[PDB]
Amino acid sequence: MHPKIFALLAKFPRVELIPWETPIQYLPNISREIGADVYIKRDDLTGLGIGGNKIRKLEYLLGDALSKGADVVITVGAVHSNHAFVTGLAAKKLGLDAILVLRGKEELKGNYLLDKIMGIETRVYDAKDSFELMKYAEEIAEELKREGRKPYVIPPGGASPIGTLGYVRAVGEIATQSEVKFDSIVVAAGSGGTLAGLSLGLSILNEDIRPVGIAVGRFGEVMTSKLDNLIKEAAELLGVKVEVRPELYDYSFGEYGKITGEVAQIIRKVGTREGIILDPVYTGKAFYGLVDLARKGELGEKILFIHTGGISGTFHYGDKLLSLL
Amino acid sequence: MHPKIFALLAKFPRVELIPWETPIQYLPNISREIGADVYIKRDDLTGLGIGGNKIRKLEYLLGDALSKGADVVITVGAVHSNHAFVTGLAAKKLGLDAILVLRGKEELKGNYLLDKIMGIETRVYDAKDSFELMKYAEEIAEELKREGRKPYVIPPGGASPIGTLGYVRAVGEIATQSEVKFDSIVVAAGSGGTLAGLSLGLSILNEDIRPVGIAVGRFGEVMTSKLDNLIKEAAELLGVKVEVRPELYDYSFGEYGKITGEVAQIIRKVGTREGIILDPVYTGKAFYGLVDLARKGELGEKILFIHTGGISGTFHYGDKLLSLL
Ligand SMILES: *Cc1c(COP(=O)(O)O)cnc(C)c1O
Ligand SMILES: *Cc1c(COP(=O)(O)O)cnc(C)c1O
């Protein structure tokens, strides 16, 4: 842990969910093929529930919830939401109650299934947007605080300002553990929250390292706008300045959730060549974006890929993947 | 890594699949309830594919396969086999070919689905026993060595002698990393291979620690007999002596694969109380056996539970679990 990032995060409360540093590995076969050195940081091994990036955010999001004495945590997402499941699981683990506000086919699979198995309260709506649901949560919240109860509402993907500190911390971890001079750090971009933290983090260490995001869905308008809005807000929390511009490419393949044979092909490749399991909605596309950029000599010689989890999506959208291979 | 276990394993070849020590955590809520300190070693985070215990065995099983120049690895199990999937994945990762000889409903779920997604060659038979298939593999093998090819056949659950060294090594890791004086180490028992390694390992360090196995299926006859046969064979490999008697209780709930509301209840409990996901076929029953023994004050004050993976079984047998909660 870098002394600087350590001192800057010192005054922030957090619940310690991750009790260790996730490992970083070199990918020999992938590296040989793309003509660049690619490493992977294993945040799919963060340990709570299905692991992944959202666990780092929850340490702060839940630290914040406990601080306000919340007794019920509410958040949203698609039915296949990784964020929703682990948010519910982590909240119950801390004696809190949770209500997941989802959207999508109510099939017993993936994280939705996991939600039911753990007995997490699930409320599915006809909505279309992930922020559309935000008002439905604000419904269950704004009211639930009538039965006395205090509610704590978390934005999509934990894209809150303190949530973002999760990856400021991750940068600190990576700085101290790795013995590699990285050229860029490639991460999938959903809410842009993880990317935001990595950006601010690198910025704080004044590292000439390119934080590269791979948008897996709706590129940007109010997205590319909240990204910057996310970066400056968390940077204000750290009472720090923000080095301008986190890169962002589009490999959503048209739309969030769209599953393609090229994404399916990357999942099988990385799986059988590095023994690592990626997912159809996030990491698979993100890594696809990695191989693409890399081969076009646009990411440098040493690339660190953040594995943000999502194995549930591979069980969930499994057959759509088969039917494409 | 204990110098002794280190020197004893020095002359054995292995492929390094796991690049780090899996963590050990204390379980506060579970510990409060059962009235004993229970810790968990995270071998569900071994990293390759779905992780788990079989990865430790494969480092030796595959080291052995490469040494004999094998070009095709063959093994067996039920369709939901964790061993079969990761064996196939690790073999392909090392440029080897694999043929999985399974048995069960050909439903696209769990590890079976994963098998197809990664494109691992799958051959399902009408057999009933896991050793019944052993002859069918020995069919595909004994013959496949006609098209020139050399085959390497792995026993059920990697229950081979060198495979067992995987957990002799694990004991070495645990000895050096933990700062806890354990009373017993509880692990699920399928082929008894993992238990065998832990036993021999503790025996080698002459630790007054009780290796406790939890049979999740057919207790023992030719099982309880191969266990001892496994322990002495691997101990002969290490040119060492064997301290007599690894404990073994039955919590199979009648039969291997049988899923019950008590096993389903433990999966939900440990999940919502420790944020850790267990599985219906192995760890859930094993941990059930933990809580039972513990409460009966029969495991001691400090208990180390080995998490051997299996998350796939929770996606696979998910609905059977719901319908029980
Ligand atoms: C939620 C998620 C992401 C995206 O995180 P953002 O902070 O929204 O960019 C990427 N990968 C996986 C597996 C996820 O679950
Ligand atoms: C295979 C397996 C076991 C049993 O291992 P043995 O070496 O056969 O005792 C236990 N738990 C899980 C999750 C497994 O996949």
UniProtKB/Swiss-Prot annotation, chains A, B:
EC supergroup of this enzyme: hydrolase
UniProt xrefs under Gene3D superfamilies: 3.40.50.1100
Q: Work out whether the entry's keyword set contains Hydrolase.
A: yes
Q: Which cysteines are joined by disulfide bonds?
A: none
Instruction: Report the InterPro entries cross-referenced here.
Output: ACCD_DCysDesulf, D-Cys_desShydrase, TrpB-like_PALP, TrpB-like_PALP_sf
Keyword tags: Hydrolase, Pyridoxal phosphate
The cofactors named for this UniProt entry are: pyridoxal 5'-phosphate
Any one Pfam family match given in the protein's UniProt record, by short name: PALP
**EC number(s)?**
3.5.99.7
Q: Which reaction does it catalyse?
A: 1-aminocyclopropane-1-carboxylate + H2O = 2-oxobutanoate + NH4(+)
Provide the positions where the record notes the PTM N6-(pyridoxal phosphate)lysine. 54
Q: Which GO terms describe its molecular function?
A: 1-aminocyclopropane-1-carboxylate deaminase activity; D-cysteine desulfhydrase activity
Its family? Belongs to the ACC deaminase/D-cysteine desulfhydrase family.
Q: What is this protein called?
A: Putative 1-aminocyclopropane-1-carboxylate deaminase
